[PDB]
Ligand binder design. Structure first.
Ligand code: MG
Ligand code: MG
Ligand code: MG
Ligand code: MG
Ligand code: MG
Ligand code: MG
Ligand code: MG
Ligand code: MG
Ligand code: MG
Ligand code: MG
Ligand code: MG
Ligand code: MG
Ligand code: MG
Ligand code: MG
Ligand code: MG
Ligand code: MG
Ligand code: ZN
Ligand code: ZN
Lengths: 129, 206, 96, 25, 81, 97, 217, 120, 87
RNA sequence: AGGGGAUCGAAGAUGAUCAGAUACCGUCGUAGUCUUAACCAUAAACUAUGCCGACUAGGGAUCGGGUGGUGUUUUUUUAAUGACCCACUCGGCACCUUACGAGAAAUCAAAGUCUUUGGGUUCUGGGGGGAGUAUGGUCGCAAGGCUGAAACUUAAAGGAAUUG
């Protein structure tokens, strides 16, 4: 049964990119999906998305460009202890110059650089490069 | 960048439906074709010839755009296109290849078939598939005469025709030649039906 | 995801499976079964000293043809009897 | 030998040790 | 393909699709006002019947059920709303 | 390794068909995997038809062939009948002639 | 004497193209080694491996010899050529030429500070030919090249200074390991880092600009 | 069997390729041509050659022969080129389909109307 | 890709598929650059002046070269109708 | 344990074949094959390929359901039916071509979306032999099923493709 709703939305985006498309219709959207879509958009990796309101749970159309190689989800939302965030981005980012690990803290769903500046920590969501 | 009176003229529209260039393929119909226009019942699909015309215009606009008009290359192993291409070649720059292709023409300098163009035109990407393929080994843009069932991998700018036979491919090749001259070329102004008969291009007999 | 539970609480299972499958490791199994201490002529220790029973002339394995000169030794801590080889030309003349 | 008949070889072989052991129960 | 409007798809190709796979999903059944001029008033019916709907006063019939849409009974009429 | 996608022969979504007996050696073989020919042929033959009508009553008669379906066991199919052996590729071709 | 064939060959000797980055820009298929010779003469070769192969024929074995050469400068241009002939020298002769032809660019970069002249890679990059996968990792300066002697020597001639390597597969079969470490560095210029999201007008093709000054006779 | 080897036929090709004006349907003189024009090491092989280049020649006269092209042909075809005088606006009007006419309407303008239905 | 003090380091900034903004790397000899010529008043094709587009080999292999050309040229003003953003 | 026992037919006996021929081939034919009541629980029980969910790509068939039509054929008086034809749509059994992609390959619309390594979950494997052996437990009338080692030995055994 449908497990991480985030997961499907991310994976869908990645197969649109790979297949060279510019649009995705994801389903079923969520507070979290938006706030993840919201981060990527903030940093270039996708264009403009749009919530469509089926009276159900939602759909989203994402418009993307091609600045994006991969946007994955970390499927157990592990806990990260502000030291451990270094070791995450190391394992799964292409280099120290770009790309973000995005996680979830009490202080909000944010990428790790904002996490580092705000200096809070929490659970790990996924990543974008 | 829209010219002015490079719209589809009535004389051209007449020209096309006599050749039946709007008569696209049967049941068979490649996903990658919006060049359609309402299926005629009893298994025939009518073709938006304005787009045919509008693409023809682009075709010409790129054929003429190549510094030396002779390393633009026409191909047709299909007999119905050989007398066509030979004639297209004649009037414009363009080196012709009618008959058997002979593979290794584009890779392998060592061949005596060896060409090396900046652009390729083609009449039936099924039968001429060789050309289409070989060019993609070596970044050579491809123009193509396509029906509703033709394979559109590695051809850019489709010209929706009817390689079912008759006068269409001839017509299309003619108009191709007509408009390339009508660009930067040894032609003339308006209506200008152009001296050369369209039946000049054509497969002959018996 | 094939196999392994990816849950956040699935630690226990994930631990247990490992314990289970370490047994398919030749060395781990040897270590815990105490195979060393149990079987094995030496204690499990590096050397062992014993006493010479008979001088032997073991024929080598193919594709080699030879007589290999060995000694049946009866280990001192053990009584276990063992046949040992006597390295280098002659040397079997040093034993008795 | 055919695996099938090697399995039969040892099917029997066990039946005899099953037998000989009984003599001693 | 490769680039298209997922947001504003053509009515036609949206039309042919399954009822659960339209942009926002919705039904494809309708209601009607059915007469059999013996009477004067008009009973509203669902396009899909299951229950073989009987008219207001007369035990007449009206429609029969099917795999889907009801079969309306011989001498009748209908509007749809 | 594997050699055919139809494996032995023609069986997908079923798990058990039911054996026929080889017309030549009587070997059992699943019916889907069988190999078959309608042995349609004339009762008379080549030469006999003239000598048939010649020494018969009625005008030209009518003539009614025999029809019997043939079931071969692969080996029996291979040893004589339809078989040869094909190239790696020709194998794939399901067309009869 | 040279005498080229190919539009591109002619344009080169005709001093109308100066560097390959030009050729790489418009992705022009090289087909005559002398092109990358005049274009890039600091090229020094290196025969990495030589191994016998054998074929049986309806009348005779055939033991010819397979040789693997790597050529490059040490300033961003590498080549991996592999060829088998029946004499070791002519096997080495031919492979070098293909290794010339093979010559591809490398995108190097900064471990993680903007300082003087790139020493490492742009990203992590994987190459897999056959069963070996070769993974390349950006390393801090002076890390060295952390790789087996062969894959090292290819990373050096490639011009890398500091990189980490991790290999996976039956790596003892060199022919596939280098073919993979080759891909791994050849893949550094497929990788859209942010600093390349900038739009370029889209250059004109050497073939059309010196169209006249090329063309056959 | 008298099948001519490749060295024979290969020479014959090349010779016709570049000395078609000169040579004839006559072996006797095509023979003598070969001396002045080709270097061969044996009488036998030379007649063997000219014998066939004479054969090849003799049927180029009645149509082309694949293998050989002296460019005279590719441009004999170019001046041999023309036909027509009748084309394909007669008689009456362009007969079209139902929707072909709908096509014209829904894009353009003037056309002779001549419609027809059809069936399964 | 600059460096410490300005200085454009790292050679060769690659092209880009005008249809998928992915990089058009070197060994991709299946990619294509189409020059569409600018014309002027009454035919006349103005030699040496182009509206140009570059398409990755990936795109051409997938067949998406034509429909993608369509969209690009038209929304750049050299086709009217032909293409449709809805489907 | 009853019934049944036509047929074919482990065992057995034979005629031949053979140097031998405990077989292949021919004959005779016990159990069996069938059925009831109870066991047994194993098959290359096979797709040698866990299940749930998402995504990624073209094509013509077909099985069931449905929707649409001034479609065909059935005549009667048009219909109503039914069968048929065309388009579409769910959900089946499959084939086709492709291959962005995967693989050691053979091949694979999954065996894809993996060193750019994380949707959820179950189970099994860790060189070969020793060996599915010894042992103990347990199930069974039995035959046997399930669970299931070690000592010792050993440099290969193995897979897919190639040329002979
Ligand atoms: Mg075990
Ligand atoms: Mg002893
Ligand atoms: Mg003691
Ligand atoms: Mg007793
Ligand atoms: Mg076999
Ligand atoms: Mg079964
Ligand atoms: Mg070595
Ligand atoms: Mg019986
Ligand atoms: Mg017997
Ligand atoms: Mg006997
Ligand atoms: Mg016996
Ligand atoms: Mg089993
Ligand atoms: Mg099976
Ligand atoms: Mg499909
Ligand atoms: Mg050995
Ligand atoms: Mg094998
Ligand atoms: Zn009523
Ligand atoms: Zn048989």
């Amino acid at each position: 049964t449908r497990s991480s709703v985030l997961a499907d939305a991310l994976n869908a985006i990645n197969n649109a990119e790979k297949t060279g498309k510019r649009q995705v219709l994801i389903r079923p959207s969520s507070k979290v999906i938006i706030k993840f879509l919201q981060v990527m958009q903030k940093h270039g990796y996708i264009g403009e998305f749009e919530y469509i309101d089926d009276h159900r749970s939602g759909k989203i159309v994402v418009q993307l460009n091609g600045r994006l190689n991969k946007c994955g989800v970390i499927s157990p939302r592990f806990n990260v202890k502000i030291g451990d965030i270094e070791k995450w981005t190391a394992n799964l980012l292409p280099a120290r110059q770009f790309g973000y690990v995005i996680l979830t803290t009490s202080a909000g769903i944010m990428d790790h650089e904002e996490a580092r500046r705000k200096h809070v920590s929490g659970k790990i969501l996924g990543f974008v490069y | 960048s829209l010219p002015a009176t490079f719209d589809l003229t009535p004389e051209d529209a007449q020209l096309l439906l006599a050749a039946n260039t709007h008569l696209g393929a049967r049941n068979v119909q490649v996903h990658q074709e919006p060049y359609v226009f309402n299926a005629r019942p009893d298994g025939v699909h009518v073709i938006n010839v304005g787009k045919t015309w509008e693409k023809l215009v682009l075709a010409a606009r790129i054929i003429a755009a190549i510094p030396n008009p002779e390393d633009v290359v026409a191909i047709s192993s299909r007999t119905f296109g050989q007398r066509a291409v030979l004639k297209f070649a004649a009037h414009t720059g363009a080196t012709p290849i009618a008959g058997r292709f002979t593979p290794g023409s584009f890779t392998n300098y060592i061949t005596r078939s060896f060409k090396e163009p900046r652009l390729v035109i083609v009449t039936d990407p099924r039968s001429d598939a060789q050309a289409i393929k070989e060019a993609s080994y070596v970044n050579i843009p491809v123009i193509a005469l396509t029906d509703l069932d033709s394979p559109s991998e590695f051809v850019d700018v489709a010209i929706p025709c009817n390689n079912r036979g008759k006068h269409s491919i001839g017509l299309i090749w003619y108009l191709l030649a007509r408009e390339v001259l009508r660009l930067r070329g040894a032609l003339v102004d308006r209506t200008q039906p152009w001296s050369i008969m369209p039946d000049l291009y054509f497969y002959r007999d018996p | 995801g094939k196999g392994k539970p990816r849950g956040l609480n699935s630690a226990r299972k994930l631990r247990v499976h490992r314990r289970n499958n370490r047994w398919a490791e030749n060395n781990y199994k040897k270590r815990l079964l105490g195979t060393a201490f149990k079987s094995s002529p030496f204690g499990g220790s590096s050397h062992a000293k014993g006493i010479v029973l008979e001088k032997l002339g073991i024929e080598s394995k193919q594709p080699n043809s030879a007589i290999r000169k060995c000694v049946r030794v009866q280990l001192i801590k053990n009584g276990k009897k063992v046949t040992a080889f006597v390295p280098n030309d002659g040397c079997l003349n040093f034993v008795d | 030998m055919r695996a099938k008949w090697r399995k039969k070889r040892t099917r029997r072989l066990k039946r005899k040790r099953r037998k000989v052991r009984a003599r001693s129960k | 393909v490769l680039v298209q409007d997922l947001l504003h798809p053509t009515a036609a190709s949206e039309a042919r699709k399954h009822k659960l796979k339209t942009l926002v999903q919705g039904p494809r059944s309708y209601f009607l006002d059915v007469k059999c001029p013996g009477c004067l008033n008009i009973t509203t019916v669902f396009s899909h019947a299951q229950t073989a709907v009987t008219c207001e006063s007369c035990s007449t019939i009206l429609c029969t059920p099917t795999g889907g849409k009801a079969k309306l009974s011989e001498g009748t009429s209908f509007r749809r709303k | 390794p594997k050699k055919r996608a139809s494996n032995g022969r023609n069986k997908k979504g079923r798990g058990h068909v039911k054996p026929v007996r080889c017309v030549n050696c009587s070997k059992s073989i699943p019916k889907d995997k069988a190999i078959k020919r309608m042995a349609i042929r004339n009762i008379v033959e080549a030469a006999a038809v003239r000598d048939l009508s010649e020494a018969s009553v009625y005008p030209e008669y009518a003539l009614p062939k025999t029809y019997n379906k043939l079931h071969y066991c692969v080996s029996c199919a291979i040893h004589a009948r339809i078989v040869r052996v094909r190239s790696r590729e020709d194998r794939k071709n399901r067309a009869p002639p | 004497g040279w005498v080229p064939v190919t539009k591109l060959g002619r344009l080169v000797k005709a001093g109308k193209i100066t560097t390959i980055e030009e050729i790489f820009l418009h992705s022009l298929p090289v087909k005559e080694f002398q092109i990358i010779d005049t274009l890039l003469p600091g090229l020094q070769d290196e025969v990495m491996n030589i191994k016998p192969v054998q074929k049986q024929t309806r009348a005779g074995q055939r033991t010819r010899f397979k040789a693997v050469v790597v050529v490059g400068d040490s300033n961003g241009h590498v080549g991996l050529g592999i060829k088998t002939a029946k004499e070791v020298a002519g096997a080495i002769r031919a492979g070098i030429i293909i290794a010339k032809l093979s010559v591809i660019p490398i995108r190097r970069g900064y471990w993680g500070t903007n300082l003087g002249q790139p020493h490492s890679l742009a990203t992590k990059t994987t190459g897999k030919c056959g069963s070996v996968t070769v993974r390349l990792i950006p390393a801090p300066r002076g890390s060295g090249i952390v790789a087996s002697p062969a894959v090292k020597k290819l990373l050096q001639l490639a011009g890398v200074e500091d990189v980490y390597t991790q290999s996976n597969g039956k790596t003892r079969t060199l022919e596939n390991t280098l073919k993979a470490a080759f891909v791994a560095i050849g893949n550094t210029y497929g990788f859209l880092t942010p600093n390349l999201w900038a739009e370029q007008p889209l250059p004109v093709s050497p073939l059309d600009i010196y169209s006249d000054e090329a063309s056959a006779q | 069997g008298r099948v001519r080897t490749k060295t024979v036929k290969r020479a014959s090709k090349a010779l016709i390729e570049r000395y078609y004006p000169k040579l004839t349907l006559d072996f006797q003189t095509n023979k003598r041509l070969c001396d002045e024009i080709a270097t061969i090491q044996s009488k036998r092989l030379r007649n063997k050659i000219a014998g066939y280049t004479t054969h090849l020649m003799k049927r180029i006269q009645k149509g082309p022969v694949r293998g050989i092209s002296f460019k005279l042909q590719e441009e004999e075809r170019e001046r041999k080129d023309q036909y027509v005088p009748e084309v394909s606006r007669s008689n009456g009007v362009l007969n079209v389909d139902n929707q072909t006419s709908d096509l014209v309407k829904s894009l353009g303008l003037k056309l002779p109307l001549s419609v027809i239905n059809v069936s399964a | 890709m600059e460096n410490d003090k300005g200085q454009l380091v790292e050679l060769y900034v690659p092209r880009k598929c005008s249809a998928t903004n992915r990089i058009i790397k070197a060994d991709d000899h299946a990619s294509v650059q189409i020059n569409v010529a600018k014309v002027d008043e009454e035919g006349r094709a103005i030699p040496g002046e182009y509206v140009t587009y570059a398409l990755s080999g990936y795109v051409r292999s997938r067949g998406e070269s034509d429909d993608s050309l369509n969209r690009l040229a038209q929304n750049d003003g050299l086709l009217k109708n032909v293409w449709s953003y809805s489907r």
